[PDB]
């Protein structure tokens, strides 16, 4: 066993009844003085390194050609001047195993952390040396972290796409279904997770040109998509991951759910395609009143009204659907469907739950379209217009397929540096650059939506780490007050940066004029309610930083009205799975699953303590499963009130609790304004 592995395992060997956390630090030293420094490839100077990486097809020469070599040297020197040290063995291990650039045979390390950060910063700046240095200081301080696609692939010749998630709308036609399969394979080839809205597809037993009981429903398309994602599996490196979203009022909703039952037959079971359920407020109202509900056949509704079932408001059209004899429907028990959802989530963590009305009551771009589904991580909530893919030799009507670039603020590092504004603006600029340089030649709706919406996702990580390292319980009202203030600041500065970009470029996102940003409605709660901390401890935490007041929000509203906004969507809190290790941060705004996690790599086992875990903050690092899910819902709703898109909200459940407890948590989340629920992980 390696020396650093032994040093890392020495953490759990208690000395005087206490964990040896400091041993972890020793491990990193070993991991660098025995493996990383020996396996790294050193050159005489930076010029030889850059030339070797350029000619050997490791780096794209275009982004490096925008800078003179003196500027690149200055950027690299700025990166290395911080003398960044990984505080834990797992941070360095995760970076150098998942994100550091290696040779073709993967026998040596070509990129250090500073080298990777410098390359990403140079790609972000697009020829601006000072902006490149700003990005270097932002990332080496670990205030901001580009998503895994962006961080891993920026400036690389053999790179994939920098966009993490893609959302596709599938129209009710064989041509559209085949095009959706093709686009899903193309985007999984690019490495991104693909989510498809199957609510427009007509249910099983519908008519295909006057011959009835002919359609296979959404389950056949689900099987096709599952096979497509199995085939396109990132060249066999990462398993192809897809998501299917269906409205709960679709007739196939049961069969949909039956795809995830552990007793499902092979002709129905789907195993590589995640499932999500979109629940309007009408379904929750029907379940609450115990009135038997009706699931609908989408094609009959489309024939009668000319619009898809998910294209209009069910809260106002459900009674018309039920009373219309030309609309076909089936009777269901909404409470039984809710119990089935809870049972399925207990068994397998599926489906994702999207509370459609919670998303669309604060959605700023309802004029473009209502949010009808979410992404594979159930945090992207954007307007999408379905595409009309016609026959060959016929022009296709290209709609809008959602796609946003992810980037997470490290809350602990951002607040320690007292740089919410600067970090938010620089992250917004980097995400705008990632969107601008993204061009997908096989997904037309994705390309058009990227060009028009200009949507970005600016997330946050290390919420629980910051709270525990500052002596604040994650479930405490003080933690929710901190989240309220911090994310109001993040939203304020993201809106300010979006408006500044719109002013400097003279262009807003498409159809901005009909948005609530243009009408000033979006700023209502910000121009009447003060989001400054209500607790003295939180206010002290925010000292040295100008917390925006109602007057600052009014000025920002006037600025947006004058100049507009460049981005339709700005903030989305992704799970941030593996890149949180490199940043020494807790995953997303979720509470920690465990204080020390035991992970098996190769034939060895390693223990990763939570960042900053110690004796004095052991009980502040409360495990998520031991927490009250209602208070976690309260925290997520408090954050969500300042996030325009959704938050990947994973439920952490105990084995003792029943499906009724899961249903109660889901209904409280819906009551509190939670937009989406990601996973039901049971301990």
């Amino acid at each position: 066993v390696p020396k650093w592995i032994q040093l890392n395992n020495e953490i759990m060997i208690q000395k005087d009844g206490k964990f040896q956390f400091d041993k972890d630090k020793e491990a990193v030293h070993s991991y660098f003085v025995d493996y990383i420094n020996q396996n790294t490839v050193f050159f005489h100077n930076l010029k030889e390194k850059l030339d070797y990486l350029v000619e050997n097809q490791y780096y794209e020469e275009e982004f490096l050609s925008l800078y003179s070599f003196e500027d690149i040297k200055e950027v690299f020197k700025t990166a290395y001047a911080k003398k960044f040290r990984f505080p834990s063995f797992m941070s360095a291990f995760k970076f150098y195993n998942d994100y550091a650039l290696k040779t073709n045979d993967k026998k040596k390390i070509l990129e250090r952390y500073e080298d990777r950060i410098s390359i990403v910063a140079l790609f972000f700046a697009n020829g601006d040396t000072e902006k490149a240095k700003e990005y270097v200081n932002l990332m080496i301080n670990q205030e901001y972290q580009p998503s895994t696609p962006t961080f891993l692939n920026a400036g690389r010749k053999r790179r994939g796409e920098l966009v993490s998630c893609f959302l596709l709308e599938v129209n009710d036609s064989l041509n559209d279904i085949s095009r959706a399969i093709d686009i899903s394979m193309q985007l999984s080839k690019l490495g991104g997770g693909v989510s498809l809205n199957l609510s427009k597809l007509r249910a099983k037993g519908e008519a295909i040109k006057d011959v009835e009981n002919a359609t296979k429903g959404v389950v056949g398309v689900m099987k096709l998509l599952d096979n497509a994602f199995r085939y396109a599996d990132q060249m066999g490196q990462r398993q192809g991951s897809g998501a299917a979203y269906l409205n709960i009022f679709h007739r196939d909703i049961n069969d949909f759910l039956d795809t995830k039952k552990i007793s499902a037959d092979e002709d129905v079971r789907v195993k590589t395609l995640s499932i999500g359920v979109v629940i309007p407020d009408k379904f929750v109202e029907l379940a609450r009143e115990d009135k038997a509900a009706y699931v609908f056949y989408p094609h009959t509704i489309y024939k009668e009204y000319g619009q898809h079932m998910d294209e209009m408001d069910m809260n106002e059209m459900y009674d018309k659907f039920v009373d219309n004899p030309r609309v076909k429907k089936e009777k269901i028990n909404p409470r039984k469907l809710l119990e089935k959802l809870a049972m399925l989530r207990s068994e397998s963590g599926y489906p994702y739950i999207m509370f459609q009305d919670n998303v669309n009551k604060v959605h700023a771009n309802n004029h473009i379209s209502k949010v009808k589904f979410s992404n594979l991580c159930s945090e992207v909530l954007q307007a999408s217009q379905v595409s009309s893919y016609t026959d060959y030799d016929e022009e296709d009507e290209i709609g809008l397929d959602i796609s946003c670039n992810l980037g997470s603020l490290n809350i602990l590092n951002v607040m320690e540096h007292k740089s919410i504004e600067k970090t938010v603006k620089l992250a917004t600029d980097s995400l705008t650059h990632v969107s601008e340089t993204t061009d997908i030649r096989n997904a037309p709706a994705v390309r058009r939506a990227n060009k028009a919406m200009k949507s970005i996702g600016l997330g946050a990580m290390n919420l629980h780490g910051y709270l525990a390292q500052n002596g604040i319980a994650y479930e405490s009202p003080e933690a929710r007050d901190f989240a309220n203030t911090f994310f109001m600041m993040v939203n304020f500065y993201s809106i300010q940066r979006s408006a500044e970009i719109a002013k400097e470029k003279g262009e807003t996102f498409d159809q901005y004029e009909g948005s609530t940003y243009a009408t000033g409605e979006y700023f209502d709660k910000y121009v009447s309610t003060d989001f400054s901390p209500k607790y003295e401890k939180i206010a002290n935490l925010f000292e040295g930083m100008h917390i925006p007041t109602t007057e600052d929000w009014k000025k920002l509203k006037a600025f947006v009205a004058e100049h507009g906004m460049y981005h339709s969507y700005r903030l989305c809190i992704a799970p941030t799975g593996s890149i949180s290790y490199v940043q020494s941060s807790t995953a997303s705004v979720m509470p920690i699953m465990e204080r020390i996690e035991e992970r098996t790599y190769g034939n060895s086992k390693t223990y990763y303590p939570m960042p900053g875990l110690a004796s004095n903050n052991w009980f502040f690092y409360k495990e998520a499963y031991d927490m009250d899910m209602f208070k976690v819902v309260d925290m997520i709703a408090t954050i969500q009130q300042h996030i325009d898109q959704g938050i990947s909200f994973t439920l952490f459940l105990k084995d003792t609790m029943t499906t009724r407890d899961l249903n109660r948590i889901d209904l409280y989340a819906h009551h509190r304004g939670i937009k989406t629920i990601y996973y039901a992980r049971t301990k």
Binding site: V284, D290, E339, M343, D655, T658, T659, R660, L667
Partner: peptide, 14 residues
């Protein structure tokens, strides 16, 4: 397989 417990109403109100 978590224990299936029916919704008892008043679970929709908070």
């Amino acid at each position: 397989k978590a224990t299936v417990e029916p919704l008892k109403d008043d679970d929709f109100y908070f």
